[PDB]
């Protein structure tokens, strides 16, 4: 089952700045939706399937 394990990507993020506040939401959106949501579901299915 390790042959289908989904890896933890590191997304480069565009640092947006709300007039004094620097933060890049690209990394947040990526590591949330792909890493902590989709990867969660896929790894859960694979972990059961083993």
């Amino acid at each position: 089952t390790s042959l289908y394990y989904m890896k933890h990507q590191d997304f480069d993020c565009g640092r947006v700045k709300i007039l004094f506040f620097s933060f890049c939401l690209g990394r947040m959106m990526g590591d949330l939706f792909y890493n902590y949501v989709f990867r969660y579901v896929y790894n859960f299915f694979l972990a059961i399937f083993g």
Partner: protein
């Protein structure tokens, strides 16, 4: 002489109002600078 004393007194009032202006402007500037505090985030 009395008129000169009058002028002196009224100039004193004018400078008190100016000092009030100074306080208002300084408070506003401090508010802006608090709104613009530096951030320690190292992203």
């Amino acid at each position: 002489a009395i008129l000169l004393a009058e002028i002196n007194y009224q100039m004193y009032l004018d400078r008190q109002i100016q000092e009030r202006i100074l306080l208002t402007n300084s408070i506003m500037l401090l508010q802006n600078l608090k709104a613009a505090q530096p951030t320690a985030d190292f992203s």
